[PDB]
Symmetry: D2
Amino acid sequence: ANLISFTFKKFNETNLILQRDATVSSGKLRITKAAENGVPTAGSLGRAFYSTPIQIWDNTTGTVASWATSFTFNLQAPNAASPADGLAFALVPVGSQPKDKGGFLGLFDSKNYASSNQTVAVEFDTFYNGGWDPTERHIGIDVNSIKSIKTTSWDFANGENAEVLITYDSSTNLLVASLVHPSQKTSFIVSERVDLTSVLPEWVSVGFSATTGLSKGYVETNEVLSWSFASKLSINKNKLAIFNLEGK
Amino acid sequence: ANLISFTFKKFNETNLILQRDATVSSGKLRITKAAENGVPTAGSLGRAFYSTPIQIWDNTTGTVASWATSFTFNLQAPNAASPADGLAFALVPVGSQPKDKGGFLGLFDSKNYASSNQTVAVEFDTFYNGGWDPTERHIGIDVNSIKSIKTTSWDFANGENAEVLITYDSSTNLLVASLVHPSQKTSFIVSERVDLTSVLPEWVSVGFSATTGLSKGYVETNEVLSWSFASKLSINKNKLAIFNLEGK
Amino acid sequence: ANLISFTFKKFNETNLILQRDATVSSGKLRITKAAENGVPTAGSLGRAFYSTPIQIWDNTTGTVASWATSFTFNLQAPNAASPADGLAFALVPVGSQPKDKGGFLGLFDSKNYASSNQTVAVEFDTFYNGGWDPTERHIGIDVNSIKSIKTTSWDFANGENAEVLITYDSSTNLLVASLVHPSQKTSFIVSERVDLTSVLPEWVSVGFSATTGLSKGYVETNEVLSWSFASKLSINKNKLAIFNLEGK
Amino acid sequence: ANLISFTFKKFNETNLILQRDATVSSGKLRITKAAENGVPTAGSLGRAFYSTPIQIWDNTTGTVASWATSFTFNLQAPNAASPADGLAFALVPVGSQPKDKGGFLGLFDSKNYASSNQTVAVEFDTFYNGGWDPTERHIGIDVNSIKSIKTTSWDFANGENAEVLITYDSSTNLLVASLVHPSQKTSFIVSERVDLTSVLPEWVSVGFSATTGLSKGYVETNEVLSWSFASKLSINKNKLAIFNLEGK
Ligand SMILES: OC[C@H]1O[C@@H](O)[C@H](O)[C@@H](O)[C@H]1O
Ligand SMILES: OC[C@H]1O[C@@H](O)[C@H](O)[C@@H](O)[C@H]1O
Ligand SMILES: OC[C@H]1O[C@@H](O)[C@H](O)[C@@H](O)[C@H]1O
Ligand SMILES: OC[C@H]1O[C@@H](O)[C@H](O)[C@@H](O)[C@H]1O
Ligand SMILES: [Ca+2]
Ligand SMILES: [Ca+2]
Ligand SMILES: [Ca+2]
Ligand SMILES: [Ca+2]
Ligand SMILES: [Mn+2]
Ligand SMILES: [Mn+2]
Ligand SMILES: [Mn+2]
Ligand SMILES: [Mn+2]
């Protein structure tokens, strides 16, 4: 069985693929733009992916990878009544480029299903886009669309660390995503069946995408403090307890 | 840093401490009694712990272990309208013996706080005991009492696998417990601050406790299909993504 | 696949089976007796095993475990021209008791093959017993006999740390043992085919055995500073890179 | 602490940086050219490195990474009396290009110390270059020169798998390299102190380099069957047991 894993407790440019406004500052992955004084700027889009492609499924053998990722993020809004747009963990084709900003989170073009995007994302959505969104802040699973196939309520705590765990089990095709705000003692969970052989190419880049608002005042930070990933592809035909010790 | 981990995809008597009705049958940990025909029996109590003690905190250094556990369980009731009582993952003192059966799950004596029990448990409670329980099936965190310090709703699916992840972070003192029913695509999550140095002895046995009803007809299986554990104790002063690959 | 591992950077009585003179002092596993002033005593025998049994092979499936262990030891002799006897890493039957002291290292009765001992050991032999030993200090593989089936020269550095790696590959039946003296930049290696299904019971205790001389003046310490173990048993049919990081 | 690891039981172009003749064929990394009939060709040079750079030391904190790698290789010569030249595991600067072929193994220019190459390599040298080589087949440690700073005898078994383990301990600055031929039950070991902060840049590519002879008839395969790597960089201040299970 082929294995790949990593743990970034601090970040570095050298092992990341940085796109647009995404930047490493003082060991922190700052996906969207912040001023020298620490003011988040509007109209920002940023992306970061790991420098090594991950084989998510094998066409010749029919094997599917089981994988898990954990990260700690922090969305900090100067004014909570007006922030946007959110951040997401995504699997994209290898040389994949950013798409629409704002509510599309740098990952999608529109609300309708476009299979040629070949993108799976778990979004953490700070802004009510209504054109497609549920009423409150939510975690969603995005398959080739910004219009999540399933969501769950997220009691987002402004400027407070969120510790995320996303797991994919090959044998049940189940994608699970959970968020914890340790300072609030709150927790949230989403689970949906996703067939990755239907959605993603055999090889993907894993990482993050985030945006700020399309208006001057709708601003927030989209920072990632730590990140851990592990994947296991069987040859023919994920120890999770040991994995979250690495990251969250 | 001292480390300990294991993964049981199948079970064996030889590395377990079996108490009361708990038994290994065909590689499955059957905590409570089942007939030769496969009929769950009432009035049953069973416990299983790992044969090696886990240091959960160090008095001399002040260090606290971070740990994670994942398991898959299956509660199967012939009649869903009348089952009891549930199963729990517990940390108990090393030579610890079973307590009250039924709604006390083999772990506690009463509803009031008794610190000398020194027991932390995450319960999966199939039965409304009301004397202390919420109205529906629930996951709860038990600290020296059967009366959980916090609960969350559990849409229990009869005879369907439940994949559980329990994590404890030393730095935030946060115990998180999540349950997934992959066949239903449902998921549930509980999080509460627990100071283990206040609750548990330095050394504990980790494992499971379960009971059937205190009436002839209130019967269910309490089976554990797989189990994974990992713990990390720093010397002075948990990679989770890699851990759940091991178990769930 | 069933997994078991641990890493002791410091030692504790609570997760060990201590036999005879073996003792934990200031986080160090002291296999043989030392005075309050730090003087090693003669005629000493000591043993330490992990509290959880390891399944080394499965009779019903025919599967054999692959395993690896790493430890750092220190043999300190007041007078190098007169020390004895050495220390060994051993796999013994579960409730196994010490045997002959001195040159037999607490593991064997005699030089002739006795299959009922069911013991595999990698010895680090400080003393020329001649009755069976090579001329100089040696690493040997012991199968049911103190008379090694294969040895290699060991340029033992008195009172200097030795970092050991022992690996067993199920698919090649190859036991490899290596010793490094980092302060000397020296290294030594032994490899021999051993069929464990022929030698060991299905379940074993893993750990250490050591002895001091059978004369007043032939004295040394037999200390173990750190210890790491991992084993993997397939269900029906070892990552050494990551192992020795955690390991050594 | 930042972590990185992988295990290739089979190979893929997508996560490798392939240079010159190096190619992936049927899941095997074939470093040097082979004909369609399976005939090794002369005058070949090939290199393969992992697509993610490894931080081997940190200038700002003074921290040095501990790392380990394990691989299985196979050198197959049609005529043993005339093969060349060998293969090596190397750490090179990130965008580093191949150097001289033949006896220089694609890694070096000459025998004299050139610090600007910034290359550490463990060589497995099939050919007596005399200009710098010991008389028989050898494992050597190469620091900025093809003239090894230390070697050891290698009883090379033609067309037989060699299982290699290379470890670097930050605290002792010790590089250890061992080779096992499981079919022969033979083993070999080399150890030397290397200060990596003196030799390598902070970031390196890890991987392999190999060459065939500079004469028509001096031909061999230089195949790598599996490969595992793990590295650990502390923030301010390696479990080998578990590593070599996943590893080898
Ligand atoms: O005002 C901020 C908002 O502006 C909308 O036009 C946009 O679609 C939203 O995603 C959000 O950015
Ligand atoms: O009838 C079944 C029930 O009986 C009650 O007396 C008991 O307290 C419950 O835990 C449950 O077992
Ligand atoms: O005096 C030292 C020696 O004494 C021998 O009789 C004994 O067999 C050796 O193992 C060694 O201990
Ligand atoms: O002919 C075989 C040999 O030829 C030499 O000139 C060369 O330096 C050696 O590396 C080897 O390839
Ligand atoms: Ca939105
Ligand atoms: Ca109850
Ligand atoms: Ca001897
Ligand atoms: Ca040469
Ligand atoms: Mn949304
Ligand atoms: Mn309850
Ligand atoms: Mn001997
Ligand atoms: Mn050479």
